[PDB]
Protein backbone atom coordinates (compact mmCIF):
# COMPACT_ATOMS: atom_id res chain seq x y z
CA UNK A 1 0.00 0.00 0.00
CA UNK A 2 1.13 3.55 -0.81
CA UNK A 3 -0.10 4.80 2.59
CA UNK A 4 1.86 2.15 4.51
CA UNK A 5 4.97 2.90 2.44
CA UNK A 6 4.85 6.63 3.26
CA UNK A 7 4.47 5.81 6.98
CA UNK A 8 7.85 4.06 6.89
CA UNK A 9 9.63 7.21 5.72
CA UNK A 10 7.84 9.36 8.31
CA UNK A 11 8.67 6.76 10.99
CA UNK A 12 12.37 7.56 10.42
CA UNK A 13 11.79 10.96 12.05
CA UNK A 14 10.78 9.12 15.25
CA UNK A 15 13.04 6.09 14.60
CA UNK A 16 16.15 7.83 16.01
CA UNK A 17 17.46 8.41 12.46
CA UNK A 18 16.26 11.97 11.74
CA UNK A 19 14.65 13.00 15.05
CA UNK A 20 17.46 15.36 16.04
CA UNK A 21 17.24 17.17 12.69
CA UNK A 22 13.42 17.34 12.89
CA UNK A 23 13.40 18.04 16.65
CA UNK A 24 13.31 21.90 16.53
CA UNK A 25 11.05 21.74 13.45
CA UNK A 26 8.40 19.24 14.62
CA UNK A 27 5.78 21.47 16.28
CA UNK A 28 3.83 24.18 14.35
CA UNK A 29 4.29 27.97 14.61
CA UNK A 30 1.74 29.25 17.15
CA UNK A 31 1.31 32.92 16.22
CA UNK A 32 -0.50 33.62 19.52
CA UNK A 33 1.99 31.73 21.72
CA UNK A 34 5.16 32.75 19.85
CA UNK A 35 3.78 36.19 18.99
CA UNK A 36 4.53 36.32 15.25
CA UNK A 37 1.73 38.34 13.63
CA UNK A 38 4.20 39.11 10.82
CA UNK A 39 4.18 35.43 9.77
CA UNK A 40 0.79 35.92 8.09
CA UNK A 41 2.22 38.87 6.16
CA UNK A 42 5.29 36.92 5.00
CA UNK A 43 3.45 33.63 4.39
CA UNK A 44 -0.19 33.52 3.25
CA UNK A 45 -0.45 29.77 3.93
CA UNK A 46 1.96 28.77 6.77
CA UNK A 47 2.41 25.00 7.20
CA UNK A 48 4.46 22.69 9.45
CA UNK A 49 5.38 19.00 9.83
CA UNK A 50 2.82 18.67 12.64
CA UNK A 51 0.14 20.17 10.39
CA UNK A 52 0.92 17.77 7.53
CA UNK A 53 1.35 14.73 9.80
CA UNK A 54 -1.91 15.62 11.60
CA UNK A 55 -3.85 15.06 8.36
CA UNK A 56 -2.31 11.60 7.90
CA UNK A 57 -2.94 10.88 11.61
CA UNK A 58 -6.70 11.41 11.11
CA UNK A 59 -6.64 9.26 7.92
CA UNK A 60 -7.32 12.43 5.89
CA UNK A 61 -4.52 11.65 3.42
CA UNK A 62 -6.08 9.27 0.90
CA UNK A 63 -2.92 9.16 -1.26
CA UNK A 64 0.74 10.24 -1.33
CA UNK A 65 -0.10 12.66 -4.17
CA UNK A 66 -1.90 14.99 -1.75
CA UNK A 67 0.87 14.61 0.85
CA UNK A 68 3.71 15.36 -1.57
CA UNK A 69 1.82 18.40 -2.88
CA UNK A 70 1.73 19.91 0.62
CA UNK A 71 5.36 19.00 1.35
CA UNK A 72 6.66 20.66 -1.83
CA UNK A 73 4.40 23.68 -1.19
CA UNK A 74 5.57 24.09 2.42
CA UNK A 75 9.22 23.52 1.47
CA UNK A 76 9.04 26.36 -1.07
CA UNK A 77 7.49 28.72 1.49
CA UNK A 78 9.84 27.58 4.27
CA UNK A 79 12.86 28.41 2.09
CA UNK A 80 11.61 32.01 1.87
CA UNK A 81 11.44 32.44 5.66
CA UNK A 82 14.50 30.26 6.37
CA UNK A 83 17.48 32.70 6.35
CA UNK A 84 20.43 31.37 4.25
CA UNK A 85 23.72 30.35 5.91
CA UNK A 86 21.83 28.80 8.84
CA UNK A 87 21.77 25.36 10.49
CA UNK A 88 17.96 25.23 10.18
CA UNK A 89 18.22 25.80 6.41
CA UNK A 90 20.68 22.93 5.92
CA UNK A 91 18.48 20.65 8.05
CA UNK A 92 15.42 21.35 5.89
CA UNK A 93 17.28 20.76 2.62
CA UNK A 94 18.82 17.57 4.07
CA UNK A 95 15.34 16.25 4.95
CA UNK A 96 14.24 16.83 1.34
CA UNK A 97 17.23 14.98 -0.14
CA UNK A 98 16.71 11.93 2.10
CA UNK A 99 12.94 11.92 1.47
CA UNK A 100 13.29 12.36 -2.31
CA UNK A 101 15.92 9.60 -2.47
CA UNK A 102 13.79 7.19 -0.41
CA UNK A 103 10.55 8.17 -2.18
CA UNK A 104 12.19 7.82 -5.60
CA UNK A 105 13.47 4.36 -4.62
CA UNK A 106 10.06 3.07 -3.45
CA UNK A 107 8.28 4.59 -6.47
CA UNK A 108 11.02 3.90 -9.03
UniProtKB/Swiss-Prot annotation:
Q: How is it modified after translation?
A: Phosphorylation by CK2 disrupt the intramolecular binding between the bromo domain 2 and the NPS region and promotes binding between the NPS and the BID regions, leading to activate the protein and promote binding to acetylated histones. In absence of phosphorylation, BRD4 does not localize to p53/TP53 target gene promoters, phosphorylation promoting recruitment to p53/TP53 target promoters.
Q: Which residues are listed under the site Acetylated histone binding?
A: 82
Record's subcellular location: Nucleus; Chromosome
Q: In which tissues is it expressed?
A: Ubiquitously expressed.
Q: What are the Bromo domain coordinates in residue numbering?
A: 1-106
What family is reported?
Belongs to the BET family.
Q: What else is known?
A: JQ1, a thieno-triazolo-1,4-diazepine derivative, and I-BET, a benzodiazepine derivative, have been tested on tumors with success. Treatment with GSK1210151A (I-BET151, a I-BET derivative) has strong effets on mixed lineage leukemia and promotes myeloid differentiation and leukemia stem-cell depletion.
Instruction: Tell me the domain comment.
Output: The NET domain mediates interaction with a number of chromatin proteins involved in transcription regulation (NSD3, JMJD6, CHD4, GLTSCR1 and ATAD5). The C-terminal (CTD) region mediates interaction and recruitment of CDK9 and CCNT1 subunits of the P-TEFb complex. It is also required for maintenance of higher-order chromatin structure.
The disease this record links to the protein is: Cornelia de Lange syndrome 6: A form of Cornelia de Lange syndrome, a clinically heterogeneous developmental disorder associated with malformations affecting multiple systems. It is characterized by facial dysmorphisms, abnormal hands and feet, growth delay, cognitive retardation, hirsutism, gastroesophageal dysfunction and cardiac, ophthalmologic and genitourinary anomalies. CDLS6 inheritance is autosomal dominant. A chromosomal aberration involving BRD4 is found in a rare, aggressive, and lethal carcinoma arising in midline organs of young people. Translocation t(15;19)(q14;p13) with NUTM1 which produces a BRD4-NUTM1 fusion protein.
Role noted for this protein: Chromatin reader protein that recognizes and binds acetylated histones and plays a key role in transmission of epigenetic memory across cell divisions and transcription regulation. Remains associated with acetylated chromatin throughout the entire cell cycle and provides epigenetic memory for postmitotic G1 gene transcription by preserving acetylated chromatin status and maintaining high-order chromatin structure. During interphase, plays a key role in regulating the transcription of signal-inducible genes by associating with the P-TEFb complex and recruiting it to promoters.
Q: How does it assemble?
A: Interacts with p53/TP53; the interaction is direct. Interacts (via CTD region) with CDK9 and CCNT1, acting as an associated component of P-TEFb complex. Interacts with RELA (when acetylated at 'Lys-310'). Interacts (via NET domain) with NSD3, CHD4, BICRA and ATAD5. The interaction with BICRA bridges BRD4 to the GBAF complex. Interacts (via NET domain) with JMJD6 (via JmjC and N-terminal domains); the interaction is stronger in presence of ssRNA and recruits JMJD6 on distal enhancers. Interacts with NSD3. Interacts with NIPBL. (Microbial infection) Interacts with bovine papillomavirus type 1 regulatory protein E2. This interactions may serve for the tethering of viral genomes to host mitotic chromosomes allowing successful partitioning of the viral genome during cell division.
Q: What protein is this chain from?
A: Bromodomain-containing protein 4
The protein's organism comes out as Homo sapiens
Tell me the gene name. Answer: BRD4
- According to the record, which residues of the full protein are present here? 352 to 457 of 1362
Amino acid sequence: EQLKCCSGILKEMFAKKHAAYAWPFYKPVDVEALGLHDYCDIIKHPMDMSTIKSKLEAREYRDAQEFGADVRLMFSNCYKYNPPDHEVVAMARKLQDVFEMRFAKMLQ
